[PDB]
Design a protein around this motif. Structure first.
Motif, short mmCIF file in Angstrom:
data_model
loop_
_atom_site.label_atom_id
_atom_site.label_comp_id
_atom_site.label_asym_id
_atom_site.label_seq_id
_atom_site.Cartn_x
_atom_site.Cartn_y
_atom_site.Cartn_z
N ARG C 57 0.83 -1.21 0.00
CA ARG C 57 0.00 0.00 0.00
C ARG C 57 0.86 1.25 0.00
NH1 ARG C 57 -4.83 0.47 4.50
NH2 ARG C 57 -4.84 -1.62 3.89
N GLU C 60 2.09 1.77 -3.45
CA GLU C 60 1.02 2.34 -4.28
C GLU C 60 0.88 3.84 -4.02
OE1 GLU C 60 -2.14 -0.28 -3.12
OE2 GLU C 60 -1.14 -1.95 -4.07
N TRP C 106 -0.64 7.82 3.67
CA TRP C 106 -1.28 6.59 4.06
C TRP C 106 -2.80 6.73 4.00
CZ3 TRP C 106 0.39 1.63 4.07
CH2 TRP C 106 -0.49 0.66 4.59
N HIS C 109 -8.10 1.72 5.63
CA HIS C 109 -9.24 1.15 4.91
C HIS C 109 -10.22 0.53 5.89
CE1 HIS C 109 -6.48 1.15 1.14
NE2 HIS C 109 -6.89 2.37 1.53
#
Lengths: 141, 144, 211
Positions: C57, C60, C106, C109
């Motif tokens: 993550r 990404e 960041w 989720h």
């Protein structure tokens, strides 16, 4: 159902089916046996916030304000016994002399000695007996 | 126009002092030409307005502030707190440079260099400008 | 990750200044990953993440800004600009920070927390805290009664007061509630933005969870 439940808050049984709770009533009306089932889903996050989290938090804050107001009360009684012994030129029967209150040490003794049982959730039993008049007040507020 | 020579060490090459030369028109931000050399060989390339923008946008930073980082990295504008790191394959001619903090390195940017065909000649130019620059700051000093 | 959940139960709540509202957040960080619980005092949201999800993550959200997972985690442990959306019931919590002199991203989720963790992280602790606070009220009220038996002994034989402003009225608990309920309860029970909770209750929160 009301007159059955009000004194108690006949026989009951509790059954879970997936997410849903069934509460079963066996009792009597007009001499004859009477049967009911309550069919309960999981309460929504709205209800749990409104009936539990928010009021319980508002109670802990208000109770923390109680502890604060009782600590300033305690210190104001300690200035008063001092004013008797230190300058009000007198004594007592000795068997009743209290220690000077300090909330740091009050909390440390409380939390070593009394916390283990004090925060016991148990059957929820003691919450319904000790805390409800505060619960109704916090919810109104 | 401005230029600025800066002396560096590649991570690849501890004991070779390299020289970075940058050359541009007052805003570094407008794009620049960049040369590396080691006294035997030389490499060059170019960076443009939209490429610096893009690099800053990939790093989510105000352009001008990112240009600050570029001046400090490429034009010796580093403070004692700033530790920059310089990397190059001559083989791929891929330059990249970084800043070190948090006990880690952090890429600040990358270049396509090309090995330069006339090594000793851009060296000649480079070090003539140095002989001039030392002599100017010398004649200024005598005066002061 | 079981130890990440165990740390989490016993972490206190922090308070987060969004632009849009505030949040309450408890977090437990290690080199192994993190676990997070968040609330806006209407809903609750959960995430747990290991280093595998961290380096994916982070690669990404931060394409070329490489690190070991543990160095990202170490910086989140320092804990910046916060924004969020509920998209479905992903409270996606979006965090902009400074690390290495670089902007960082960041996104948490966070799914609607399970009723079981809401019980373990709020209801049961918060209940346990109310019972424990009430036993503290009970012990300050015995202590106040004990100090009155003491002071009444003075009032029973000689012992006049010198400073004409030190008087205490005799402590009586029902009336101390009566005055509190009118004068103090409105303000004191107000949830507000959860800053009162994080400001004065976290010690009892930590103790009751560890009990």
């Amino acid at each position: 159902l009301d007159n059955l439940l009000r004194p108690l808050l006949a026989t009951f049984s509790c059954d879970c089916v997936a997410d849903a709770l069934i509460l079963r009533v066996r009792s009597e009306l007009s001499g004859l046996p009477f049967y009911w089932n309550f069919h309960c889903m999981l309460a929504s996050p709205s209800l749990v916030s409104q009936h539990l989290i928010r009021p319980l938090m508002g109670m802990s804050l208000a109770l923390q304000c109680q502890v604060r107001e009782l600590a300033t009360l305690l210190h104001m009684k300690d200035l008063e016994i001092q004013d008797y012994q230190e300058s009000g030129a007198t004594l007592i029967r000795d068997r009743l002399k209290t220690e000077p209150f300090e909330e740091n040490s009050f909390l440390e003794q409380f939390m070593i000695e009394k916390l283990p049982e004090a925060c016991s959730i148990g059957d929820g039993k003691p919450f319904v007996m000790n805390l409800q008049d505060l619960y109704m007040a916090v919810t109104t507020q | 126009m401005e230029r600025k020579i800066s002396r560096i060490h590649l991570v690849s090459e501890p004991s070779i002092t390299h020289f970075l030369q940058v050359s541009w028109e007052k805003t570094l931000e407008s794009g620049f030409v960049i040369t590396l050399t080691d006294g035997h060989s030389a490499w060059t390339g170019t960076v443009s307005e939209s490429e610096i923008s893009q690099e800053a946008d990939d790093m989510a930073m105000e352009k001008g502030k990112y240009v600050g980082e570029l001046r400090k990295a490429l034009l010796s504008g580093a403070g004692p707190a700033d530790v920059y790191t310089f990397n190059f394959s001559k083989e791929s001619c891929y330059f990249f440079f970084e800043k070190n903090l948090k006990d880690v390195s952090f890429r600040l940017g990358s270049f396509n260099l090309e090995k330069v065909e006339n090594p000793a000649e851009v060296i000649r130019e480079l070090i003539c400008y140095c002989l001039d620059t030392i002599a100017e700051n010398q004649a200024k000093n005598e005066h002061l | 990750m079981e130890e990440l959940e165990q740390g989490l139960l016993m972490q206190p709540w922090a308070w987060l200044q969004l632009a849009e509202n505030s949040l309450l957040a408890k977090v437990f960080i290690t080199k192994q990953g993190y676990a997070l619980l968040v609330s806006d005092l209407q809903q609750v949201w959960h995430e747990q993440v290991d280093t595998s999800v961290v380096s994916q993550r982070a690669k990404e959200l931060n394409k070329r800004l490489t690190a070991p997972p543990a160095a990202f985690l170490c910086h989140l442990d320092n804990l910046a600009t916060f924004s969020c959306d509920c998209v479905a019931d992903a409270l996606i919590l979006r965090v902009r920070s400074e690390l290495s002199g670089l902007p960082f991203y960041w996104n948490f989720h966070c799914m609607l927390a399970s009723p079981s963790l809401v019980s373990q992280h709020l209801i049961r602790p918060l209940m346990g805290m109310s019972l424990a606070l009430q036993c503290q009220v009970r012990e300050l009220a015995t202590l106040l009664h004990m100090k009155d038996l003491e002071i009444q002994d003075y009032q029973e034989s000689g012992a006049t007061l010198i400073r004409d402003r030190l008087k205490t009225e005799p402590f009586e608990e029902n009336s101390f509630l009566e005055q509190f309920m009118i004068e103090k309860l409105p303000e004191a029970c107000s949830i507000g933005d959860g800053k009162p909770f994080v400001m004065n209750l976290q010690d009892l929160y930590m103790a009751v969870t560890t009990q």
